[PDB]
Design a protein around this nucleic acid. Structure first.
Ligand SMILES: [Mg+2]
Ligand SMILES: [Mg+2]
Ligand SMILES: [Mg+2]
Ligand SMILES: [Mg+2]
Ligand SMILES: [Mg+2]
Ligand SMILES: [Mg+2]
Ligand SMILES: [Mg+2]
Ligand SMILES: [Mg+2]
Ligand SMILES: [Mg+2]
Ligand SMILES: [Mg+2]
Lengths: 37, 101, 195, 509, 304, 72, 128, 133, 132
RNA sequence: AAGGACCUGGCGGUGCUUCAUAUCCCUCUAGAGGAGCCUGUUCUGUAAUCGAUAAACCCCGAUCAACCUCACCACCUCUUGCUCAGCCUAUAUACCGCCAUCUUCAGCAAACCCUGAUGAAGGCUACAAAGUAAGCGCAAGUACCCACGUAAAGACGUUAGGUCAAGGUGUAGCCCAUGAGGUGGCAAGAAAUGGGCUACAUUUUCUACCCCAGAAACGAUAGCCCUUAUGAACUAUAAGGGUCGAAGGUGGAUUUAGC
């Protein structure tokens, strides 16, 4: 289940051990978009 | 967190088919059997007709796991041809050589 | 900041217990391995990659462990435990005389966490009726019953059991099937007498 | 630090798995293994019976307090005498105002208390609180087990001749027939005493052997330690050598959890006695069978290896040094290296010290000059091998490289003043300009010395009038002994070169 | 440069270690032993030796590089160094000196071979120049040292036999002589025992050819070997076959019969049979079908 | 491949011979025909155990006993 | 999904479009340029939303000669760390994007009065 | 110098029952590398010969399976890309081999597998006749 | 012109490693397979499970040891036991290295319910096959 | 701006010479444009996908669409909606990833030197006159039965070549929607064209054998009815049986594949 996989990796990112490059990319572009309106 | 809503629906159909697998088998036997009363065959027919949707094993599809591509998926590997070629080129999997014969 | 000590090449002597330093299967560990063995496609005016970063020697299966010396040592160690085969049994005919009923199962072993696979349940067995029936009526009866389970060229009757998932269950069902088959071939019926 | 960080990571993984079981809930592996299954310390819904049964499963005390509350306030009934005994077992094992409160709340239970309950209360009050309470509990018990009477005995103990006597007498009188763990505990309490209990310990152990229960694994070693000491006892040492030789000859079976101190204090006695056959036998002890689990803690292993190699050094030493070169594995502390260098000095094997110092530097020999000073003194007290002067210069250069690391610590400032003389002499003994400019730096930092005068004189005579003068005359103007040496130096050819430096020499003289 | 000696000594140490590993007295030890040891201790499915694991001596691992050709200062050592191709220049100078010396007195070597022999590259043009000079020198007489100089470069011809293998005769019961042979085909493989003393009828898996081959071209092919040799009814043959095609089995039987008859018949007649061309397995096989093609060679029609 | 998963000490005869499980109907009727074919298929199938086989059988029992209104 | 995720460099390539049709022919684009960035180098692997203190990587493992234990960073401390990381990223971006002042020579947008510094030292060694 | 004094031997017990007689242990190793298969079979035959049992070595042919994939993504029917999975077989037969010898040998080999190999055991054991017959 | 597991030829300032330098049609000829299992062979099964799980292994380990690795991994599955081999740089401290090693090993063992081990080889700078 | 002379490429229904491997022909064979059938394309209407849609698509995405596959449409519902949202919404003229193309090629080239008065640019004369070359590709070697051969490979770049619909992502939008959920049909041909199958004959058709025989002087894989395979669902999907027993008489330019 992608459910288990992604939930585990999300919780572990929140712990701050797995530097998810894809998620960093995503959230960075989302920060940029919310800054630009 | 499945790939998409079509994969979500496919997995729901698969789970429903599994959890109604044996019963559907039994009533399908009771239908397709011939020496038994045709009235009982018809009873089982409307039973199957009243069974809920997404319950048959025919509505599901052998879709891909990675890219959710329905077509071009091998039953053995369950991977799309594109992802299979990707992994074979990157040498991730084992024991696959190019047929340069 | 931190520094890595030099490899064990100069440290390891020519006289050395290789089976002891490599008891079990393990990676190549070139730092511990003193041999300069390299493997890789050499470049024009070049050479294969040194053992330092040669991950292809790791890709390939590993057999540094279990040297000939290690194999010898472990064989002489387990020689205490292995038993002897009966010297009276030195031929196929003698073995089949001592124990006519042959039976054989089979199963694979594969890399992975799970180990069961339904092919474990199957078991075949063989027996020739040239010496077991001791009669003609039941012989003809059972050879009429069985359609293709027999072989008249090599003179063997073979039967397979997989109807049960357990190997012991298949074994017990096969033996009980042979027993009931013999018991039902012993007797006869009126439509069998009238032919 | 590394392996304890590994263990901390193991604990961390335990935390993740027991905080999020649903991820590792799937049973992918065919053989079901509860060790691999997630662990669930989760209380279920309120149910006094199964909750009290689960008390023994959760292994804590807040649940037990809450259950006692629920059973006393509104219920007023006992689910089971065995359940109450288990609750009391847990509460005594967990025990300090908290222990006082627990002990005063072990009197709010129902009257259904038996030998088991009373004796577990005694156990708890002994191994967690004062001993007068345990004594009162035992008097109450009499008014109304092995480990229970054990606790009572060590509570009474922890001079008391009459008490010890009556205790032992009536304890042996009763039909308990302990497994001698009571004896082991009273030995632990008798860790220190004079002969009037050291020698009676021998007859008590003879009685132990007569009854035939103990393997003599812990009490024997404890009396060995109690033998500790103004004068070594060679007679007792040989007797115990024979005894432990028979112990090693026979195979061992572990029974006492205190076998970890055995190893360490045994090797301490080994370092006190100082006998080679004793060391051989104590090595054969752990080298006989699967007994190498008794080493255990790194501190005890360190003490053992340290004293072992120390005695082996202070025992030819070729066998010893090859034993070491084969069985270093971790890098030992300086002490062992000091004893090694002393053994190498007494043996006169000069060619071995470079390799040992190189090994120490490779492993962990950095930022400490005690062993450097020792090596330098021992090696340039020698100057016999001429071809080895190249190795002298090389190891001196390596020592100086190790020295010059960073000044922020200030510790490298006093190393040249202590041991630069031998280093520079070794450098002098082929290439010499390095030694010349290094003595220059040394004096330009001084603490002159007679060995330093000899160094200067030999360097000057092996070396060029002006090149020798610009050193000897300068150090003469600096200090007087180089001037008393310059008086002799200026005779041959130094004086005729130029007069101003000779005038400075005359002025300073 | 010191790294070369470092690798040499370390390779010797590793050879001693491997000898101790595989359990042999490290003194007597050989390259084939090294190869077998490395193949057993570290197998590899790589096809090319270039990529397979190889424990080789450093002198053969590293290719020859021209060492420093000029001293630490001043002039270079050789007298052609200021121009490239200095070694070949000196060689041509010496060859021309020898040529003019002989004047006043009165197989070949591969380009790449000379390349690895020297430490510089060259062109086809000056290679042909060198070959021309060699042949011009050889057209005339040649002294002993001159012949040896030329033979240093000239290599072995390595000529093949140009002959068809001769199988040994065999003897079985009743003192009966015969000869066995085997032939193959696209998908048919057969083995034939030719009996000399016997003659006449032929057996094929226990069945005669007249009714085993309803068509006559197969029997004509079976006759072609006997027909060319001209011994028709003086030798009998048994044969066992396993194949799919009729003509395939016919050709296999023909090849096996010829390969068994060449043993009995004289070597001159075997040479005549080879000139006839019936003693070589057909290398032609049905080509593979291609993924984009409609067949083995035909493509889809050009749609434009 | 059978270290564990012994099927609760089940037996080959308990798997295959369903004659003891088949008692509440005569030996000629169409329900007999269908349930005999069911027992044959169950014995042929090794994947399912006696528990699932008796589950099949009892479910068919309930089926035709709550449809006992016909018995034609 | 997580299986849909992949490494960084290919995303960077697909986003920047360094070698598409636009870059060829010299057509380029209207003075827009996506600047390269690396997020892995910035933050240490330790901190996250849940501020567990790691003696192995986040906190020094030994303090006062005593092994440490896993603990929690409170809400205020976590928010302080978040604000500090925000300020650090802002400082990094500021230092990244700045002005460039090449001395104006003959005129702006001209390579006339600009010097490239002394020549490069020769191979044999010749400082100019 | 460190050579242990007393070797700890595992416990062994000869139970009341007789050991089973395997007529033939026929093992089949499937692999991807001829060299790995040769090394593994040399290992096995050397162990068997040093344990003192008969041996024999055969080499079945190479099996290959190929299947065609579209080289491109959207529209390309002429151009395909192919693959091939090659499995190589090796047989090893052992005759007149006692039950406990089989146990020890199979434990040894099953611990001495390499990774990229599959191993199929076929065990043939003879027995006497039943009592009900 | 095919683009498949290959790096573009640059001016010659792009260090490239063996596996990513060589083409995907040179895998069996001049390379080895990163993983080695029998699911691809005949008679085995769960090959899709093997592929998905090992891909997840590689992903999770690459992202839980980020910036330290410089090449692909080596998986070696003998029956039950799993072995991983990595090549890393001496970037971070041995403390962190061992902590993450134990953490990942424990988590993977708990997840796959399988005996797992992993080894790492340190390198000062990533080995380069050629400059492309 | 116009203009004069020059550098490079393309172009020439551009000259001379050497070639064209199944490609140009003359040549050799078998086919496509004749009739029927299967399957795409254009086009008609439907509320009813989409994209490629010259060479370099037209049994193309698709090695599958009766229901999911469904992305279209009518109707009926959900509003943090499995997603710390979602969107097959636009942009292939942002892209990555993946391929056609010349390629049935052999050139592409960092880094130096030289010539042109130090211009765009070029650097070829071997009995040699300024070219030297990293590296890539080719090649070689590797796979099959070889060393030939077939496969494999085939760089720099053109077509802003195809693909935001394998998957993701930059930008712009829906974020009660342009998102999501459940019922249905949609998926026919007045028509034109394409690729393949069938036969138009006696080298054919039928009968047993796969080749020594005996007869006829052929052609339905379309339609109607029935049976069977699985499905919950056979009006019809597939296979079989009875009937129907025609078009068709070997092709209207031209053109395709092959040593
Ligand atoms: Mg379907
Ligand atoms: Mg300006
Ligand atoms: Mg292609
Ligand atoms: Mg659909
Ligand atoms: Mg939509
Ligand atoms: Mg385009
Ligand atoms: Mg080539
Ligand atoms: Mg190709
Ligand atoms: Mg375009
Ligand atoms: Mg159906």
């Amino acid at each position: 289940n992608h459910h288990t996989y992604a939930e585990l990796m999300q919780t572990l990112r929140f712990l701050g051990l797995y530097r998810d490059e894809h998620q960093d990319f995503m959230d960075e572009q989302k920060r940029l978009k919310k800054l630009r309106g | 967190h499945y790939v998409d809503w079509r994969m979500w629906r496919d997995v729901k159909r698969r789970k429903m088919a599994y959890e109604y697998a044996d019963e559907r088998l039994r009533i399908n036997s009771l239908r397709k059997n011939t020496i038994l009363p045709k009235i009982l065959q018809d009873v089982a027919d409307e039973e199957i007709a009243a069974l809920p949707r997404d319950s048959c094993p025919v509505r599901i599809r052998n879709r891909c796991v990675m890219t959710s591509r329905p077509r071009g998926v091998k039953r053995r590997w369950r991977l799309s041809r594109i992802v299979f070629r990707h992994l074979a080129d990157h040498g991730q999997l084992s024991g696959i050589q190019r047929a340069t014969w | 900041r931190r520094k890595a000590l030099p490899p064990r090449t100069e440290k390891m002597a020519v006289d050395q217990d290789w089976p002891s330093v490599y008891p079990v299967a393990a990676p190549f560990k070139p730092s511990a391995v003193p041999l300069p063995v390299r493997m890789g496609y050499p470049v024009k005016k070049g050479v294969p990659m040194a053992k330092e970063g040669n991950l292809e020697l790791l890709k390939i299966p590993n057999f540094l462990h279990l040297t000939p010396v290690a194999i010898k040592k472990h064989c002489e160690a387990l020689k205490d435990f292995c038993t002897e085969w009966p010297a009276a049994l030195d031929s196929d005919e003698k073995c089949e005389k001592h124990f006519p009923i042959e039976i054989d199962s089979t199963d694979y072993v594969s890399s992975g966490p799970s180990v069961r696979n339904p092919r474990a349940r199957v078991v075949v067995l063989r027996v020739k009726l040239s010496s077991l029936n001791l009669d003609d009526h039941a012989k003809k009866k059972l050879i009429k019953l069985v359609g293709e389970r027999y072989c008249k060229t090599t003179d063997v009757l073979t039967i397979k059991t997989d109807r049960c998932p357990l190997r012991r269950q298949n074994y017990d069902y096969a033996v009980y099937l042979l027993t009931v088959l013999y018991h039902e071939s012993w007797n006869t019926e009126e439509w069998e007498k009238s032919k | 630090s590394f392996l304890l960080a590994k263990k901390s990571g193991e604990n961390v993984a335990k935390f993740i798995i027991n905080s999020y079981p649903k991820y590792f809930q799937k049973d992918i592996a065919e053989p079901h293994i509860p060790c691999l299954m997630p662990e669930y310390f989760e209380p279920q819904i309120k149910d006094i019976s199964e909750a009290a049964l689960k008390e023994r499963i959760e292994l804590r005390k807040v649940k037990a307090s809450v259950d006692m509350f629920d059973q006393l306030l509104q219920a007023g009934t006992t689910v089971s005498l065995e359940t109450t005994n288990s609750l009391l077992d847990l509460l005594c094992y967990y025990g300090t105002w908290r222990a006082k409160n627990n002990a005063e709340r072990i009197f709010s239970l129902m009257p259904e208390k038996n030998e088991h309950s009373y004796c577990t209360m005694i156990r708890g009050m002994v191994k967690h609180r004062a001993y007068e309470q345990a004594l009162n509990l035992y008097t109450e018990l009499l008014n109304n087990d092995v480990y229970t009477f054990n606790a009572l005995i060590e509570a009474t103990v922890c001079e008391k001749w009459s008490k010890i006597l009556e205790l032992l007498r009536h304890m042996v009188a009763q039909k308990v027939k302990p497994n001698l763990q009571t004896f082991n505990t009273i030995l632990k309490c008798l860790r220190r005493f004079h002969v009037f209990a050291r020698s009676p310990a021998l007859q008590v152990l003879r009685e132990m052997k007569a009854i035939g229960i103990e393997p003599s694994l812990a009490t024997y070693h404890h009396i060995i330690r109690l033998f500790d000491p103004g004068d070594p006892l060679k007679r007792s040492s040989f007797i115990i050598y024979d005894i432990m030789n028979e112990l090693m000859g026979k195979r061992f079976s572990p029974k006492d959890p205190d076998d970890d101190k055995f190893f360490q204090s045994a090797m301490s006695i080994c370092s006190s006695l100082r006998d080679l056959e004793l060391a051989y036998q104590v090595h054969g002890l752990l080298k006989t069978g699967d007994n190498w689990k008794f080493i255990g803690p790194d501190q005890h292993r360190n003490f053992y290896y340290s004293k072992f190699f120390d005695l082996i050094c202070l025992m030819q030493i070729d066998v010893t040094l090859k034993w070491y070169e084969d069985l270093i594995p971790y890098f030992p502390h300086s002490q062992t290296m000091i004893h090694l260098l002393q053994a190498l000095d007494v043996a006169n094997r000069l060619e071995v010290i470079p390799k040992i110092w190189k090994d120490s530097k490779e492993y962990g020999h950095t930022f400490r000059s005690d062993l450097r000073e020792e090596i330098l003194m021992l090696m340039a007290r020698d100057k016999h091998p001429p071809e080895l002067q190249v190795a002298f210069a090389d190891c001196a250069a390596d020592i100086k490289s190790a020295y010059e690391s960073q000044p922020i610590r200030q510790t490298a400032q006093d190393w040249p003043a202590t041991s630069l003389n031998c280093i520079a002499i070794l450098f002098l003994r082929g290439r010499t300009q390095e030694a010349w400019k290094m003595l220059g730096l040394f004096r330009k930092h001084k603490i002159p010395r007679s060995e330093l005068l000899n160094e200067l004189m030999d360097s000057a005579k092996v070396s060029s009038p002006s090149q020798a003068i610009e050193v000897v005359e300068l150090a003469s103007a600096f200090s007087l002994p180089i001037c008393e040496g310059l008086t002799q130096r200026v005779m041959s050819d130094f004086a005729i070169n130029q007069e101003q430096k000779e005038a400075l020499s005359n002025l300073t003289a | 440069e010191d790294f070369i000696k470092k690798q040499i000594e370390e390779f010797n140490i590793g050879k001693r270690h491997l000898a101790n590993m595989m359990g042999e007295d490290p003194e007597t030890f050989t390259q084939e032993d090294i190869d077998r040891a490395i193949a057993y201790l570290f197998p590899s499915g790589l096809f090319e030796k270039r990529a397979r694991p190889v424990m080789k001596h450093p002198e053969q691992i590293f290719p020859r590089q021209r060492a420093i050709q000029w001293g630490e200062d001043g002039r270079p050592f050789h007298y052609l160094f200021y121009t490239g191709k200095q070694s070949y220049y000196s060689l041509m100078h010496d060859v021309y000196g020898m040529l003019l010396n002989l004047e006043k007195h009165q197989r070949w070597l591969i380009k790449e071979e000379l390349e690895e022999m020297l430490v510089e590259k060259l062109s086809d043009l000056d290679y042909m120049q060198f070959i021309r000079l060699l042949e011009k020198l050889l057209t005339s007489q040649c002294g002993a040292a001159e012949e040896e100089f030329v033979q240093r470069f000239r290599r072995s011809v390595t000529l093949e036999s140009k002959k068809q293998l001769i199988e040994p005769v065999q003897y079985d019961e009743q003192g009966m002589a015969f000869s066995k042979s085997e032939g193959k085909r696209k998908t048919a493989k057969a083995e034939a025992i030719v009996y000399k003393h016997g003659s006449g009828r032929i057996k094929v898996n226990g069945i005669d050819y007249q009714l085993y081959f309803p068509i006559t071209q197969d029997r004509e092919q079976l006759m072609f070997p006997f027909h060319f040799v001209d011994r028709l009814g003086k030798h009998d043959v048994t044969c066992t076959v396993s194949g799919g095609g009729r003509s395939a089995q016919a050709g296999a039987i023909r090849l096996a019969m010829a390969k068994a008859l060449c043993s009995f018949v004289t070597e001159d007649e075997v040479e005549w049979m080879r000139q006839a061309g019936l003693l070589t397995t057909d290398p032609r096989v049905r080509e593979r079908k291609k993924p984009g093609q409609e067949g083995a060679r035909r493509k889809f029609t050009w749609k434009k | 491949n059978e270290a564990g998963f012994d099927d609760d000490g089940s037996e080959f005869h308990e798997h295959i011979f369903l004659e003891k499980h088949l008692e509440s109907f005569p030996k000629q009727g169409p329900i007999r025909h269908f349930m005999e074919l069911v027992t044959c298929g169950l014995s042929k199938n090794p994947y399912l155990s006696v528990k699932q086989k008796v589950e099949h059988i009892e479910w068919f029992r309930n089926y035709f006993n709550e449809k006992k209104d016909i018995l034609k | 999904s997580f299986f849909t995720k992949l490494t960084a460099d290919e995303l960077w390539k697909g986003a920047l479009a360094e070698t598409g049709a636009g870059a060829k022919k010299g057509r380029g684009k209207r003075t827009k340029k996506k600047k390269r960035k690396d997020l892995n180098r910035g933050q240490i692997i330790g901190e996250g939303r849940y501020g567990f203190l790691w003696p192995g990587l986040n906190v020094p493992l030994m303090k006062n000669g005593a092994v440490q234990t896993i603990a929690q960073r409170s809400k205020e401390e976590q928010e302080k760390v978040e604000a500090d990381m925000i300020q650090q990223r802002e400082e990094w971006d500021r230092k990244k994007k700045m002005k460039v002042k090449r001395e104006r020579g003959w005129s702006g947008n001209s390579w006339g009065g600009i010097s490239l510094g002394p020549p490069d030292p020769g191979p044999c060694g010749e400082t100019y | 110098v460190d050579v242990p004094k007393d070797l700890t031997k595992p416990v062994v017990t000869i139970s009341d029952e007789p050991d089973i007689l395997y007529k033939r242990l026929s093992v089949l190793v499937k692999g991807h590398d001829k060299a790995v298969l040769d090394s593994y079979e040399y290992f096995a035959v050397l162990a068997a010969k040093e344990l003192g049992i008969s041996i024999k070595v055969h080499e079945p042919p190479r099996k290959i399976e190929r299947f065609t994939l579209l080289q491109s993504v959207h529209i390309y029917k002429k151009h395909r890309v192919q693959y091939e999975m090659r499995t190589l077989y090796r047989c090893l037969e052992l005759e007149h081999l006692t039950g406990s010898t089989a146990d020890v040998y199979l434990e040894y080999i099953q611990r001495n597998l390499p990774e990229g190999v599959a191993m199929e055991v076929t065990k043939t054991q003879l027995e006497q006749l039943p009592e009900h017959i | 012109k095919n683009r498949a597991a290959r790096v573009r030829v640059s001016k010659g300032d792009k260090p490239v490693t063996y596996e990513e330098a060589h083409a995907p049609h040179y895998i069996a000829h001049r390379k080895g397979w990163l993983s080695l299992h029998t699911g691809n062979l005949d008679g085995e099964d769960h090959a899709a499970e093997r592929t998905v799980e090992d891909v997840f292994l590689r992903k999770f380990m690459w992202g839980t040891f980020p910036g330290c690795l410089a090449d692909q991994l080596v998986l070696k599955r003998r029956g039950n036991q799993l072995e991983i081999c990595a090549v890393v740089l001496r970037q971070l401290s041995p403390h962190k290295y061992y902590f993450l090693v134990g953490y990942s090993e424990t988590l993977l063992s708990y997840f796959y319910k399988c005996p797992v081990r992993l080894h790492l080889q340190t390198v000062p700078s990533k080995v380069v096959y050629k400059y492309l």
